[PDB]
Design an enzyme around this catalytic site. Structure first.
Site, PDB file in Angstrom:
ATOM      1  N   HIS A 223      -9.118  -6.219 -12.878  1.00 30.42           N
ATOM      2  CA  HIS A 223      -8.024  -7.058 -12.259  1.00 30.42           C
ATOM      3  C   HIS A 223      -8.665  -8.101 -11.370  1.00 30.42           C
ATOM      4  CE1 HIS A 223      -7.712  -4.163  -8.761  1.00 30.42           C
ATOM      5  NE2 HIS A 223      -7.748  -3.304  -9.762  1.00 30.42           N
TER       6      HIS A 223
ATOM      7  N   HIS B  29     -12.657  -9.276  -2.379  1.00 34.73           N
ATOM      8  CA  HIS B  29     -12.330  -9.717  -3.759  1.00 34.73           C
ATOM      9  C   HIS B  29     -11.516 -11.006  -3.606  1.00 34.73           C
ATOM     10  CE1 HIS B  29      -8.946  -7.278  -2.509  1.00 34.73           C
ATOM     11  NE2 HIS B  29      -8.306  -8.309  -3.172  1.00 34.73           N
TER      12      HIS B  29
ATOM     13  N   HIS C  27      -8.375 -13.720  -5.592  1.00 33.25           N
ATOM     14  CA  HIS C  27      -7.246 -13.916  -6.478  1.00 33.25           C
ATOM     15  C   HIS C  27      -7.330 -15.435  -6.800  1.00 33.25           C
ATOM     16  CE1 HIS C  27      -5.378 -10.049  -5.487  1.00 33.25           C
ATOM     17  NE2 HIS C  27      -5.955 -10.361  -4.360  1.00 33.25           N
TER      18      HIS C  27
ATOM     19  N   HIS D  29      -9.851 -11.921  -0.036  1.00 38.97           N
ATOM     20  CA  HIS D  29      -9.377 -10.804   0.799  1.00 38.97           C
ATOM     21  C   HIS D  29     -10.548  -9.915   1.207  1.00 38.97           C
ATOM     22  CE1 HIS D  29      -5.119 -11.070  -1.142  1.00 38.97           C
ATOM     23  NE2 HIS D  29      -5.318 -11.947  -0.174  1.00 38.97           N
TER      24      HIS D  29
ATOM     25  N   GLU E 124      -2.205 -16.014  -3.054  1.00 43.58           N
ATOM     26  CA  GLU E 124      -1.051 -15.093  -3.030  1.00 43.58           C
ATOM     27  C   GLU E 124      -0.102 -15.522  -1.900  1.00 43.58           C
ATOM     28  OE1 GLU E 124      -2.796 -10.977  -3.224  1.00 43.58           O
ATOM     29  OE2 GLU E 124      -2.059 -11.311  -5.233  1.00 43.58           O
TER      30      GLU E 124
ATOM     31  N   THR F 190      -1.530  -5.867  -2.356  1.00 43.29           N
ATOM     32  CA  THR F 190      -0.827  -6.798  -3.270  1.00 43.29           C
ATOM     33  C   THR F 190      -0.999  -6.370  -4.736  1.00 43.29           C
ATOM     34  OG1 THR F 190      -2.532  -8.481  -3.437  1.00 43.29           O
ATOM     35  CG2 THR F 190      -0.922  -8.745  -1.532  1.00 43.29           C
TER      36      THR F 190
HETATM   37  O1  LIG Z   1      -6.255  -6.587  -0.848  1.00 47.22           O
HETATM   38  S1  LIG Z   1      -4.815  -6.656  -1.146  1.00 47.22           S
HETATM   39  O2  LIG Z   1      -5.009  -7.344  -2.825  1.00 47.22           O
HETATM   40  O3  LIG Z   1      -4.307  -5.419  -1.734  1.00 47.22           O
HETATM   41 ZN   LIG Z   2      -6.347  -8.980  -2.787  1.00 46.81          ZN
END
Ligand SMILES: O=S([O-])[O-]
Ligand SMILES: [Zn+2]
EC number: 4.2.1.1
Length: 258
Positions: free
Chosen positions: A62, A92, A94, A117, A104, A196
Site C-alpha cells: 500500500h 511512509h 501517500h 507521515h 490526504e 488513514t
Molecule cells: O499513518 S496514518 O497513514 O495511518
Molecule cells: Zn500515512
C-alpha cells in the site's frame, strides 16, 4: 476482497470490513485555515532525531515504509500538544498519479502532490500494538510535499525504490537521517484523528506542519514506478494511495501560530 485503492476495494468500501471507517474521529480532514483556533497554550514541538537508527525499507503493498529501531528512546517527539514521549517507528508517504493530488489532508481544499507521515507511539504503552488501542497512543507528524526544487535528503530514499518494486520486497536501509525531510518551520495544526488506512483506529494526535517541503518532478516520478502487486503478478502501479477528507464532526483544529 482485501482493501486497497482500486474501484472495487477503495476507500468507499472500507466500512464493510472496518465499520470504524464511519467513526467520529476519522482522518484525514480538510484544514479550514480561517476556522482553526490559534491556541497560545500549545508548546513548540520538540523533535530529537539525532540518534535515529533506520533499519529497513519495505514495500507492504500500500506504500513503502522506512522502519527505525524503536527499542529505546533514540528518535522521539515530545512537546506540542503531547504529554509524554513518542518514539519514531516508521515513516511512509501517500502520493498521486498527477502533481495536483496525492496528499490526504488538504488546506482550504488545496491538495499537495504527496504527504509524508512520521509515525510515533507513546512509550507509556510499552509497544506499538498496545499504543494503537489507546486514544492518545500515536502521534503522526504530517508534512506536505509540493513539486519544485529537489530535496537532497530524499534522494537516498528515491534511489533504493528500484530494489523494492513489488509487494513484500525489503532492503537494508541503515544510516538514513530523517532530519533531512523537515521544513524550516515547525508551526503546525493539530486535531485528534485516526490511522488513514485499515484498521483506521482512532488513536492518533495529528500534527500537520504548515510549511510544505519541495521535491522535484523526477523524485515524485520515481514513487509512481512502484507496484501494488507482488512479483510475477500483473502490474498495477502504486499511485493514488490516499484516502479523501472525512467529516470533522465534533472536532476543533487548533493552530500553534497566528
Ligand atoms: O499513518 S496514518 O497513514 O495511518
Ligand atoms: Zn500515512
Amino acid at each position: 476482497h482485501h482493501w486497497g485503492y482500486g474501484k472495487h476495494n477503495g476507500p468507499e468500501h472500507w466500512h464493510k470490513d472496518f465499520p470504524i471507517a464511519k467513526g467520529e474521529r476519522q482522518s484525514p480532514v480538510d484544514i479550514d485555515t480561517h476556522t482553526a483556533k490559534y491556541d497560545p497554550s500549545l508548546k513548540p514541538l520538540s523533535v530529537s532525531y539525532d540518534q535515529a537508527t533506520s533499519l529497513r525499507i519495505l514495500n507492504n503493498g500500500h506504500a513503502f515504509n522506512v522502519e527505525f529501531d524503536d527499542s529505546q528512546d533514540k528518535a522521539v517527539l515530545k512537546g506540542g500538544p503531547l504529554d509524554g514521549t513518542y518514539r519514531l517507528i516508521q515513516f511512509h508517504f501517500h502520493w498521486g498519479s498527477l502533481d495536483g493530488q496525492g496528499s490526504e489532508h488538504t488546506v482550504d481544499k488545496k491538495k499537495y502532490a504527496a504527504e509524508l507521515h512520521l509515525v510515533h507511539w507513546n512509550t507509556k504503552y510499552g509497544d506499538f500494538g498496545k499504543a494503537v488501542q489507546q486514544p492518545d497512543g500515536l502521534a503522526v507528524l504530517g508534512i506536505f510535499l509540493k513539486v519544485g526544487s529537489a530535496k537532497p535528503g530524499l534522494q537516498k530514499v528515491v534511489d533504493v525504490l528500484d530494489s523494492i518494486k513489488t509487494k513484500g520486497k525489503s532492503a537494508d536501509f541503515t544510516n538514513f537521517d530523517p532530519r533531512g525531510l523537515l521544513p524550516e518551520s515547525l508551526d503546525y495544526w493539530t486535531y485528534p484523528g485516526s490511522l488513514t488506512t485499515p484498521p483506521l483506529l482512532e488513536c492518533v494526535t495529528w500534527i500537520v506542519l504548515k510549511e510544505p517541503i519541495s521535491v522535484s518532478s523526477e523524485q515524485v516520478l520515481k514513487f509512481r514506478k512502484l507496484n501494488f502487486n507482488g512479483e510475477g503478478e500483473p502490474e498495477e502501479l502504486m499511485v493514488d494511495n490516499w484516502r479523501p477528507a472525512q467529516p470533522l464532526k465534533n472536532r476543533q483544529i487548533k493552530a500553534s501560530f497566528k
